[PDB]
């Protein structure tokens, strides 16, 4: 009838907080929970035949994710499937620790699977320049592929640009359609330059135009402040906004247009 631990989250976590700062878990909607840190998001989706967990945070943030899952009363061994947003250390750095202690099978896009297998980028990664423990990928996720676990059902959408193998996940919670849209930010390491890889930008455009048109009632981001999750939690009754994915993707296209303006 209102938050309850999401109110505690607003009091405990700030906007653009530290990646490894401990934070409380709260319920997003129905079977979907937030189990991430104050700076890095981790999405837990519970079902009758196990749970799905998206993203791990860093190797230090995975300790907070493990704690937050236990705070809600859910068993880590009941986490049967691990998913990812994109293959950066602040989101999948502790994936190997969560996979080892839960026994879940980790699904990843081909480009992300190479990073998890090697523990590092990644020639075409815009931020190629910290390594993390290697993880065991059990399945490959392509564009439009579905993930099934009992009554749970998630569909992935290849939305590269921030990373070559970034994914955006969409599921239903009972209804409401939630979308875990990737960071998609036109950020990179100094000296990478976006305009040098036009093969990388057309696919960037293709995923952005796909994300904007997805059925999308509630928006979630690996960096919570990317979708103003804290403001939506503090200001309103629900996290769901009409045209949430349409506004977010248009904002990314605006940032991308200004990023390509810094070419010359």
What separation in angstroms does the CA of 14 have from each of 5, 9, 40, 97, 234?
A: 15, 9, 12, 26, 11
Q: Is 197 known as a binding-site position? A: no
Q: Is 223 known as a binding-site position? A: yes
Q: Is 8 known as a binding-site position? A: no
Q: Cβ of residue 134: shortest distance to Zn ion, in angstroms?
A: 18
Task: Quote the strand ranges of 99-195, DSSP E.
Answer: 105-108, 137-140, 146-149, 152-158, 167-173, 176-180
Residue 90 binding Zn ion, by CB under 5 A: yes
* Number of residues this chain uses to bind Zn ion (CB under 5 A): 2
Break positions in the chain: residue before each gap, C to N over 2.5 angstroms:
129, 174
Choosing from 88, 172, 230, 259, the residue that interacts with Zn ion (CB under 5 A) is 88
Helices and strands (H, E) in the chain, number of each type: 8, 12
Q: Cβ of residue 233: shortest distance to Zn ion, in angstroms?
A: 20
Exposure string of 134-143, with b = 16+ CB inside 10 Å and e = fewer, is ebebeeebeb
DSSP 82-118: EE-S---HHHHTTHHHHHHHH-PEEEE-HHHHHHHHH
Q: Is the Cβ of residue 89 or residue 156 nearer to Zn ion in the bound state? A: 89
Q: Cβ of residue 206: shortest distance to Zn ion, in angstroms?
A: 19
Which region, judged by CB under 5 A, interacts with Zn ion, from 89-97, 102-110, 129-137, 242-250?
A: 89-97
Terminal-residue alpha carbon distance, the chain: 52
Three-state SS at 80: strand
Q: Is the Cβ of residue 19 or residue 107 nearer to Zn ion in the bound state? A: 19
Residue 51 binding Zn ion, by CB under 5 A: no
Q: Is 11 known as a binding-site position? A: no
Q: Are β-strands 146-149 and 218-220 bridged in parallel, bridged antiparallel, or unpaired? A: unpaired
Which DSSP symbol is given to 76? G
Q: Is the Cβ of residue 103 or residue 110 nearer to Zn ion in the bound state? A: 110
Q: Cβ of residue 240: shortest distance to Zn ion, in angstroms?
A: 23
What separation in angstroms does the CA of 177 have from each of 86, 140, 192, 218?
A: 21, 24, 36, 6
Q: Is the Cβ of residue 123 or residue 235 nearer to Zn ion in the bound state? A: 123
Q: What is the dihedral of CA 129, 162, 206, 146, to 10 degrees?
A: 110
Q: Cβ of residue 158: shortest distance to Zn ion, in angstroms?
A: 16
Q: Is 88 known as a binding-site position? A: yes
Which region, judged by CB under 5 A, interacts with Zn ion, from 54-62, 90-98, 135-143, 254-262?
A: 90-98
Q: Is the Cβ of residue 182 or residue 217 nearer to Zn ion in the bound state? A: 182
Residue 232 binding Zn ion, by CB under 5 A: no
Q: Is 143 known as a binding-site position? A: no
The closest residue (CB) to Zn ion is 88
Q: Is the Cβ of residue 46 or residue 221 nearer to Zn ion in the bound state? A: 221
In the annotated binding site, the residues are 86, 88, 90-91, 162, 223
List of residues contacting Zn ion (CB under 5 A): 88, 90
In the annotated binding site for Zn(2+), the residues are 86, 88, 90-91, 162, 223
């Amino acid at each position: 009838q209102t938050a309850v631990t999401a109110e505690h989250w607003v009091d405990s976590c700030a906007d653009w907080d530290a990646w490894d700062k401990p934070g409380p878990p709260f319920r997003v909607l129905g079977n979907t929970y937030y189990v991430g840190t104050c700076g890095i998001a981790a999405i837990l989706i519970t079902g009758d035949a196990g749970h799905v967990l998206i993203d791990s945070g860093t190797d230090r943030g995975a300790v907070i994710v493990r704690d937050n899952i236990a705070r809600l009363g859910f068993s880590l061994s009941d986490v049967k499937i691990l998913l990812h947003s994109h293959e950066h250390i602040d989101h999948v750095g502790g994936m190997a620790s969560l996979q080892s202690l839960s026994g879940a099978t980790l699904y990843a896009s081909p480009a992300a699977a190479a990073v998890m297998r090697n523990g590092t980028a990644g020639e075409d990664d815009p931020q190629a320049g910290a390594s993390f423990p290697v993880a065991r990928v059990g399945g490959l996720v392509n564009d439009g592929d579905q993930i099934a676990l009992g009554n749970l059902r998630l569909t992935a959408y290849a939305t590269p640009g921030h990373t070559p193998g970034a994914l955006s996940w969409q599921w239903r919670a009972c209804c409401t359609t939630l979308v875990y849209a990737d960071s998609l930010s036109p950020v990179s390491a100094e000296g990478y330059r976006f305009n040098a890889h036009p093969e990388y930008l057309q696919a960037y455009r293709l995923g952005l135009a796909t994300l904007a048109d997805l059925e999308c009632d509630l928006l979630l981001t690996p960096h919570p402040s990317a979708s103003q999750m804290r403001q939506r939690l503090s200001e309103r009754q629900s996290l769901a906004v009409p045209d949430a994915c349409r506004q977010y993707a248009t904002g990314i296209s605006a940032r991308l247009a200004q990023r390509l303006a810094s070419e010359a």
